Nucleic acid binder design. Structure first.
Length: 223
DNA sequence: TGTATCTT
DNA sequence: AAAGATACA
């Protein structure tokens, strides 16, 4: 048992020996020596530990991990108990309350419940320097997360990609827009949420698409 | 003070 | 590249 889930490792391990990945891992190691980097090393790949890769139905793609202490744990927007949901997650919960009739605030911020249902909770960049949003961009993570999206694009059908923010949306070009369903809106951070996230109705729309394709919907209350 | 996006 | 301007606690 290790950092990568077995099915994810099987289909992404071809990246490990590539120069960009070696330089990426080297960069993160050096950063960890001189700064506080989030999430902890053992939690960078938590997004591979929640379901088999073939059972992914929905992809939520954000920018990068939470950059405050004890927040980021390898699932986009998620915080483990007893950590309070950050402003971004409270905004996600606010949208869910208007979008999903039966949804009420769960009283915690752990999104493992969604991930287990086949919702990939990915960020475009997978580490961050404390207190500095997007500080680890353009270092190799983009190419790696491109490999994640590209594998899913090729080996699946009728996926729902939810691309939240400019940086997540860079991956839109790698997705077959007829074969899969790309929904795009502003990042749920208070700095950007007012630019379309509120009222985007991504959660109900996702389930509409899934049910149309004959797939089981996500129970957004199941956390 | 703290939580993106556009523009240059 | 990287920095300045731009809802609500």
């Amino acid at each position: 048992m290790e950092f990568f889930g077995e099915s994810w490792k099987k289909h992404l391990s071809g990246e490990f020996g590539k120069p960009y990945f070696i330089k990426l891992m080297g960069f993160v190691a050096e950063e960890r020596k001189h700064y506080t980097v989030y999430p902890p090393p053992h939690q960078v790949f938590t997004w591979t530990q929640m379901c088999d890769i073939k059972d992914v139905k929905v992809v939520i793609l954000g920018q990068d991990p939470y950059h405050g202490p004890n927040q980021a744990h390898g699932l986009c927007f998620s915080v483990q108990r007893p950590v309070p949901p950050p402003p971004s997650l409270e905004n996600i919960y606010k949208e869910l309350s208007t979008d999903i009739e039966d949804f009420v605030h769960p009283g915690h911020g752990d999104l493992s419940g969604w991930a287990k249902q086949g919702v990939l909770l990915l960020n475009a960049v997978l580490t961050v320097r404390a207190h500095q949003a997007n500080s680890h961009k353009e270092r190799g993570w983009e190419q790696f997360t491109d490999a994640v999206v590209s594998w899913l694009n090729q080996n699946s059908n009728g996926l729902v990609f939810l691309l939240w923010g400019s940086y997540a949306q860079k991956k839109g070009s790698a997705i077959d827009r007829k074969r899969h369903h790309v929904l795009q809106t502003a990042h749920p951070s208070p700095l950007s949420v007012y630019r379309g996230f509120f009222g985007c109705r991504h959660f109900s729309k996702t389930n509409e698409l899934l049910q149309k394709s004959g797939k089981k919907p996500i129970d957004w209350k199941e956390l």
